[PDB]
Symmetry: C5
Subunit: 69 residues, 5 copies
């Protein structure tokens, strides 16, 4: 799956349908994988660089793949 | 959904019916989403600014949407 | 529900029936709410003041309500 | 249940059958309680003293009771 | 089960099929055990040494056993 954005997590958002949004770089993206919610908030709190990989690389696009560095 | 309050979490409370209350700004609000309990206590501990979005923007009102910054 | 004890958590204990005991002030109290285990150990680690509310305010009494400050 | 060992946790191990081993003092002990995995790793990271109570107080013995201080 | 690699976690990756990859030493390995995701990210954040044990000790090999030190 191609790299879409790499950077520090700017903010996260819990959504009404239980999906989770993250803003990294210039994109707001969401995931429906519940296991990623605490992992991404941890990455946000500790200032980790993340790379999100998705073919839906546009604002509001979905993803499931993330690299934590 | 409109912004209701933005600020640091002043306290949280676990309730007898397993919902979770947070006090942000001048409002006490609750959520029935279990996944948000550890996320909100983490935001409280680390001093994150949160924005809660809800149409029930009054003391005792419910919410599911939260932005963590 | 009335306030029973307020203070820093002295110790916590996982029990054989999967309930969780906490010692705050002069009371040892337990809860059967699984969601509260990680929250209470976080409060213990970070030195938060907690208030436990319960009508069974005696050693070995049960509770479900907790305020984290 | 009697005290078996007290001390800082030296290491933990996730096992192939999803049980979790801890080494405290001179004993390696395991638990089948999933809820204890994150609690014990937190105790390890923060240097907490733990007391494990079990009647199977020997290397490879099972436990469910733990006091976190 | 034999030791395969020991070292600090270089990066972790959440995968599209909900497995989790870790790079330790010269190997990229994955696990299908959901409970290990938060444990491994905690080990990564805090700089813990981990040892992964697996008979599939090659890039892309699976594991379930991990020692955290
Ligand atoms: O978390 C939501 C969702 O994330 C992942 O899917 C993403 C989009 O939601 C999904 O529409 C997108 O599908 C692609 C196909 O991968 C591609 O082969 C096809 O040509 O175009 C569609 C539309 O762009 O894929 C992205 C991730 O690449 C995840 O796969 C999915 O299960 C779900 O978790
Ligand atoms: O966590 C509890 C609850 O939070 C969210 O719902 C909130 C209130 O509980 C709910 O009564 C409120 O209803 C709104 C309608 O959505 C809106 O269309 C109408 O105009 O006004 C009523 C009353 O304010 O909605 C808020 C959220 O804005 C969440 O949606 C719900 O599922 C549940 O989690
Ligand atoms: O986690 C265990 C338990 O905690 C909460 O209940 C507590 C006691 O376990 C319960 O026996 C006690 O019951 C009270 C009633 O609240 C009171 O109205 C009646 O007059 O006397 C009885 C006996 O003391 O209540 C406390 C909490 O105040 C929690 O409510 C319960 O669901 C369970 O989680
Ligand atoms: O996590 C595994 C297991 O831990 C607890 O049980 C422990 C041993 O696994 C179990 O074999 C042992 O049994 C005791 C009897 O309870 C006792 O009555 C008899 O005298 O001796 C045997 C052998 O030592 O008990 C220990 C705990 O003391 C936990 O109870 C069990 O449910 C399970 O979680
Ligand atoms: O998380 C994925 C997976 O990890 C563990 O299995 C690993 C490989 O996925 C599995 O193919 C491998 O099988 C071994 C046999 O157990 C062994 O008897 C034989 O000699 O070699 C094969 C191939 O290496 O085992 C490793 C772990 O050593 C875990 O056991 C499995 O349930 C699953 O979680
Ligand atoms: O305590 C060390 C070992 O724990 C686990 O095995 C225990 C127990 O020791 C053993 O006798 C029993 O057959 O299985 C238990 C787990 O269900 C691990 O599986 C071992 O690798 C040791 O770490």
């Amino acid at each position: 799956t191609p790299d879409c954005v790499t950077g520090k997590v700017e903010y996260t958002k819990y959504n009404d349908d239980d999906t989770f949004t993250v803003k990294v770089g210039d994109k707001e993206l969401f995931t429906n994988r519940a296991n990623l919610q605490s992992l991404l908030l941890s990455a946000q709190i500790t200032g980790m660089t993340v790379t999100i990989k998705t073919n839906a690389c546009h604002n509001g696009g979905g993803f499931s793949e993330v690299i934590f560095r």
